[PDB]
Symmetry: D2
Subunit: 304 residues, 4 copies
């Protein structure tokens, strides 16, 4: 199995709202054009970074449709289709296959801690609604409250559409164990942005992150140093990216609200705000937004 | 402030489905008639037990409408209105006020761990969409991933519609601390069914549970023994209820799937199945359903 | 099996030091005389409250010897004998049997998370070093990092010296499950002082606490109200005891440092300080010590 | 500040017992000779891997004395001196300085979750008992139950003897954050063996592990590939070491019991068993011991 189109930097795609807080087709297209021009491997659409939790099935369809209008044939497209219930997730998995996305992805069931067999049934029911599309399993125990165990992964590998795991848990051992267990026909994507270099070297051939969109060139360059085996140059970029993450996370407003504001300053992008309950930016946050935006420009000057 | 209508046994209302898996208006009405006949203080509608997580805003409106259509009697109605996003929760809080429910309730934001100010903003935005209705804060850290802290509770007590907390966390100290801090104009509802008697004596004047619907008379009798100060007889009913809970939880199928099946055997109620991803009953579960239904009949005979 | 001598209030015995920080035989004797005069059911010697973690095997022998030298009266003596390694725990279990203590107690192995079979081997090796003495399993997962599971408890009940569990975990369901499973020949001791009344009514016939020593009469009165079925008066004492606990815990200095200081003010007892690494009291703590000591006097006046 | 002598592979030194379970001076010397001949940077003496938790102050003195007789001037020596109480830890810190060890190390206080100021006081009291010796702080939240926070680390950096952190927590971000915060005059040691390569590239210039002693050459070679920037060869060794770890951890007997047994098979070393409560090997474990020992020989043949 050939998974080359999934190897590299795949930024998680942000939610693009107009001035009223509705999904902006124009906004979505503009952010996709930004990603095409920046030369990233692909986009991870309607994930946690895309505020999926807060969107309707229709909101999520519009996002993907407008992503495809611009990225179809140009970028690799992974659409996250998981919803609270199974029927909404199946509708999105069907819709995604209709647009010809490269892969569909799903986080586990949330809120309740469902047994392993219920998680496997949920994922396979989604996969069956898109029977010709590749499938990425999301391991995010911090948020979902349930983890992808080695046994659940063995069970999921029985589904031939399953191409691998997007690992957002903090231990890099999880990436190593998933990779070693699955072998060469599977791909592990690195989830913690702050550990990008560490996840990549231990076996993650993929990378999906929520902070990539704020500085795509830094991650591409980081990935370039990793591939070259230039670890000192990699370490130096990693520390600069993390220093920016910690700054974006020190705000009152949500990290994604900070990022959208940065993209206005650095790129003239109009992405709207964050959907409630995510906290919006306050006046005091503007200095944080400006300092982080400048840290990005300064890190690009220093490392590109 | 008078909170007498909230004191006593308030079973969490189950998700009543037709044979196609859609909300059954007929089904909802029948389960409401059941609770009226059982003489419970009220009903907690569209909570976790009512599979709220898996319902649409429209599904949740239909449930409440059909509950109210029958709750002409002595049912104190608490409608849980919290949804993944704020605008869906506001729509439900408005709709509930239009039907004249006694109170509205909300779990915290889920999946992401939002700061305290974002949680308070979420709850107050819901409360503002129903400005004349009483408000219940739901503390369920096991599932929501965030807890109602003492400071967040002090902050929420600034909202005059807030009448108290529905405490589902395991420490009874949480009930004691919330009660002591809030005083006499507030009510704490006991969430863990298995600790009913323990929560009640330390200060919970209310009780909301997901297993009450399966044996309402046992809990009413338990509450009667508590009020009388009959601790030995309370203990005997508590242990019998918990013995039934552990049996209902030993099934492959979800606890709520087991309960609906029991209500078919013991009360001829047609409630449908559980919505996916909740796991349905399997053939092996039929014996557990039959045995727990009998344990209920035998416990009623022994204690009523 | 008759366990009447273990039913009631059993304060955890504090580490009595001389002005040089060494075990005070005189000090120990004086605190034992205190508990005899206070009319408590017994004493729990060399537990976490007795700073066992920080004592040598010799320190722990001296404490028990001087307790026994005075516990001529009606003190049911439970000696905690668990040490980091097994051989130190066996030496203490043997020594305790030589002094004719009523029971020996043990926390699980700490620091490393040892499998269930290693925990059972540890406890049975201790029990075998005192083959004629009663045995108490201590469940304290917050501190030990391992919990007494239902299966480990079934395994331990094969040892005839095991008389029950001292439950310090926060869920009262743990007391209920241990009691229901073990039956009438076993005793469950209530560990969380702040939930005393809640633990007692759900099935704990015993009570061991670290704050009992600071206000023995309040707990005795609380227990008296419980037994009488006076839930309203029990609640009033419970809330007054918890209000004192939270005040004793608001200090910079360790809770046990605060308690010893209170016993100096209220009972003229000379108990020394707390052994490092436990933090000592600071100047700012004197007011908290003075206020909590007064809260104790005022609560005795109000409830006795 | 020059920390070159701490950079590289520093295996945690095992507890060497004679046939009765006492500390064997001859045994200790023999294991030190093994480490000298294998060409590792140094040894981490009386850590968790050296069963410190289960040793007396005298046991720990004998170990270090016999380590020094053989390693003094030849290997870098880091002695872990932390005990349950402060006075035992000070006695060991003094004793270690008397033998002229390169550095002393300490885990935080255990069992109780002590406030940050109590942890800092504990470590500085140890450091003051060895005022001319370098100091390594151990971050091991999984076992200690308390973590080294960024604030506690800022506080500890005020002590000029503090040379860095030995990070055993699972997130590599912890290594990155400690390093970035401390700068060039500090060293971070990698604790999780299974993430060696990942910890090293993100900023850990040091490495201390409990499995190093079982295959020193594999880790030295791994470290050599890392330094060369040969990441594919590094990944291949990492996966082979982890495959051996998982095998050593699948036994009934404790991982350290398995390692000592392997050193008997592969090196003819007589290290004794593990001190109770650590579980000993069973007959069924011998096949696991032999297979893992062979996996070591086969991995050395394949990668050296
Ligand atoms: C816990 C979490 O949200 N993890 C993020 C990270 O990319 C995260 O934004 C980053 O590491 C900053 O903390 C992703 O793995 C998940 C994500 O972007 C998505 O699913 O949309
Ligand atoms: C964690 C949880 O779901 N707890 C239950 C308890 O009533 C009960 O202990 C549970 O239903 C059965 O054990 C409720 O608090 C939740 C509930 O009824 C609701 O929110 O609808
Ligand atoms: C976690 C903990 O230490 N709990 C205490 C409780 O008695 C009490 O809640 C605590 O001392 C004060 O809150 C006891 O169970 C421990 C104890 O007294 C002992 O082992 O000596
Ligand atoms: C949690 C734990 O014990 N971690 C170990 C690891 O080296 C461990 O043995 C290894 O990663 C295998 O799991 C070390 O970091 C600690 C250690 O060796 C010591 O302090 O002696």
């Amino acid at each position: 199995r050939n998974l080359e189109k999934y190897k590299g930097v795949i930024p998680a795609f942000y939610a693009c709202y107009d001035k009223e807080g509705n999904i902006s087709p124009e906004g979505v297209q503009g952010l996709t054009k930004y990603f095409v021009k920046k030369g990233v491997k692909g986009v991870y659409v309607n994930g946690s970074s895309g505020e999926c939790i807060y969107q309707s099935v229709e909101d999520r369809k519009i996002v993907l449709e407008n992503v495809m209008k611009v990225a179809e044939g140009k970028l690799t497209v992974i659409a996250h289709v998981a919803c609270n219930n199974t029927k909404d997730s199946q509708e999105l998995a069907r819709h995604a296959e209709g647009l010809g996305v490269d892969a569909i992805a799903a986080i586990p069931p949330i809120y309740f801690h469902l047994p392993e067999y219920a998680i496997a049934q949920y994922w396979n029911a989604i996969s069956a609604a898109a029977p010709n599309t590749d499938f990425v399993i999301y391991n995010i125990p911090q948020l979902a409250g349930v983890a992808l165990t080695q046994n659940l992964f063995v069970e999921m590998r029985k589904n031939p559409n399953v191409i691998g795991v997007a690992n957002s848990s903090m231990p890099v051992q999880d990436i190593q164990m998933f990779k070693q267990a699955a072998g060469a026909e599977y791909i592990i994507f690195n989830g913690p942005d702050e550990q990008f270099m560490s996840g990549r070297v231990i076996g993650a051939e993929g990378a999906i992150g929520g902070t990539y969109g704020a500085m795509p060139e830094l991650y591409l360059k980081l990935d370039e140093c990793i591939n070259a085996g230039k670890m000192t140059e990699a370490r130096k970029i990693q520390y600069a990216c993390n220093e920016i993450i910690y700054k974006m996370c020190s705000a009152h407003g949500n990290m994604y609200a900070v990022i959208k504001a940065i993209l206005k300053i650095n790129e003239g992008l109009e992405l709207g705000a964050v959907r409630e309950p995510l906290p919006a930016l306050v006046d005091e946050d503007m200095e944080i937004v400006k300092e982080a935006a400048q840290m990005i420009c300064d890190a690009k000057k220093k490392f590109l």
